[PDB]
Amino acid sequence: VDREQLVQKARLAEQAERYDDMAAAMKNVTELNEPLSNEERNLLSVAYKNVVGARRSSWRVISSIEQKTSADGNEKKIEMVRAYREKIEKELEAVCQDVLSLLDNYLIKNCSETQYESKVFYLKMKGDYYRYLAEVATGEKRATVVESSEKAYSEAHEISKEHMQPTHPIRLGLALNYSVFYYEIQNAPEQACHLAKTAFDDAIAELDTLNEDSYKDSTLIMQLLRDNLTLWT
Amino acid sequence: REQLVQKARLAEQAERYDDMAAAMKNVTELNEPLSNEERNLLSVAYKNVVGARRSSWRVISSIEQKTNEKKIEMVRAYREKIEKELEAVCQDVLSLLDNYLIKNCSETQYESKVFYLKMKGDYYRYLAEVATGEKRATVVESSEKAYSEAHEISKEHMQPTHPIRLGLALNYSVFYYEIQNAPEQACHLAKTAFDDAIAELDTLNEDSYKDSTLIMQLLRDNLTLWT
Amino acid sequence: RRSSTS
Amino acid sequence: RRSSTS
């Protein structure tokens, strides 16, 4: 039940497409209270992203069905669809809160003062999962999770502008998700487009100095950025 | 009752086949016969569940055979976890079949009886897939029984182009090939079913031709793979 | 490549 | 359409 076999079990679960078990193994590895290496960090990220993404896809499907069953006016049908959507939503919220607890209690806390890369990574994760909580929240709790995601994204972006290269995939993904938060969560297309274009231009300014692998990793996220930019018009 | 069925349809649209299987299991536990749509919903739900389990188990077994005592022990323990999950799903399906589905078939409802006996043979074959040693024997024999009966009934009261009979022949030949390692009997059964459906291929008219031709092409593919 | 079932 | 993320 040691760290090596836990990481191996996470890799196994990934190969077996069983991402709940992968997330559980990486949660145990994180609960060992020791800092995570880049490989363990990426394994945890992939596991919990796949879990939350499955829950998000199910929630999207059921909510899209609910929006039409509501316009049709069937009482029992809309009641059952709403109940199932709430079930999937509670699952999604539980996964998100599990990730946020792992971040606040273990991951962000054990970051050294000079570990700006891990700080940006974990704050981006916090912002992403609070945004996922915002996708399903209504009322004052929606504003609360929006403020949490905003603070996480802003802190991560400041640390990233100070200590990370514009072409680093972590910074590019942070800027992409921050712009998506501005556009889809805040309905603020101006600052969303501004941040996305600023990130794209800062990456263009140094794209020539990248290795092949770095070039590919950065250009993928830059493609995502310019696709989101073209979409926002 | 219809709320459970629409919940199963929602779960299928949400790719949550555990919830779909649970909803159709409740519908079956209502002790009433299942319509064609509900029968297909139950079949699809439990097939997807057990298929996810089978895929995970095959991945883990391939990795276990392809590969340190601690790592090997961890791999074996994970494979055991997945084996237990798969056997639990199969036992759930078999209990549903023996307690409600097969039991509620009248002496003349040959279509649903063949359908449920084919399902029983399928899930006993899924048990035998992961079974090793002595315990394997019984779960093979049951799979041979549920198929065999389902064969005779379908041989006597169903047309050779019926999709239920064709799928039964397909899974039965697969059983004979992969479980009992009897390629001659498997090829014989598959070819007999295929040619019997070919001889009366003109009887399909725009309503059941696709559901039969797909299974016939699966039969032909298995036959060309075996020879 | 294993055998195809329904 | 939905905005592409990470």
Author numbering:
A (entry chain C): 2 to 234
B (entry chain A): 4 to 70, 75 to 234
C (entry chain E), D (entry chain G): 365 to 370
Task: Tell me what the authors wrote about this structure, in their words.
Death-associated protein kinase 2 (DAPK2) is a CaM-regulated Ser/Thr protein kinase, involved in apoptosis, autophagy, granulocyte differentiation and motility regulation, whose activity is controlled by autoinhibition, autophosphorylation, dimerization and interaction with scaffolding proteins 14-3-3. Moreover, the C terminus of DAPK2 contains a motif recognized by scaffolding proteins 14-3-3, whose binding decreases DAPK2 activity, both in vitro and in cellulo, suggesting that 14-3-3 binding may suppress DAPK2 activity, in addition to autoinhibition and homodimerization. Yuasa et al. showed that 14-3-3 binding to DAPK2 is regulated by Thr369 phosphorylation at the C terminus of DAPK2, which creates a mode III 14-3-3-binding motif RRRSSpT369S-COOH, where pT denotes phosphothreonine. Indeed, our crystallographic analysis and fluorescence polarization measurements revealed that Thr369 phosphorylation at the position −1 from the C terminus creates a high-affinity canonical mode III 14-3-3-binding motif whereby 14-3-3γ binds to DAPK2, as in other mode III motifs.
To characterize the interaction between 14-3-3 and the putative 14-3-3-binding motif of DAPK2 at atomic resolution, we solved the crystal structure of the phosphopeptide ctDAPK2-pT369 (sequence RRRSSpT369S) bound to 14-3-3γΔC (ΔC denotes C-terminally truncated 14-3-3γ without the flexible ~13-residue-long C-terminal tail). Our FP measurements confirmed that 14-3-3γΔC binds to FAM-ctDAPK2-pT369 with a binding affinity similar to that of 14-3-3γ (KD = 161 ± 7 nM). The 14-3-3γΔC:ctDAPK2-pT369 complex crystallized in the trigonal space group R3, with four 14-3-3:peptide molecules in the asymmetric unit. The structure was refined to a resolution of 2.7 Å, and the final electron density allowed us to build all seven residues of the ctDAPK2-pT369 peptide. ctDAPK2-pT369 occupies both ligand binding grooves of the 14-3-3γ dimer in an extended conformation and interacting with 14-3-3γ as described in previously reported complexes with other mode III motifs. The phosphate moiety of pThr369 is coordinated by three 14-3-3γ residues, Arg57, Arg132 and Tyr133. The C-terminal Ser370 residue of DAPK2 forms two hydrogen bonds with the 14-3-3γ residues Lys125 and Asn178. Moreover, the ctDAPK2-pT369 makes several additional polar and hydrophobic contacts with residues from the 14-3-3 ligand-binding groove, including Glu185, Asn229, Leu232, and Trp233. Our measurements confirmed high-affinity binding to 14-3-3γ, with a KD of 114 ± 3 nM for the phosphorylated peptide. As expected, no binding to the unphosphorylated peptide was detected.
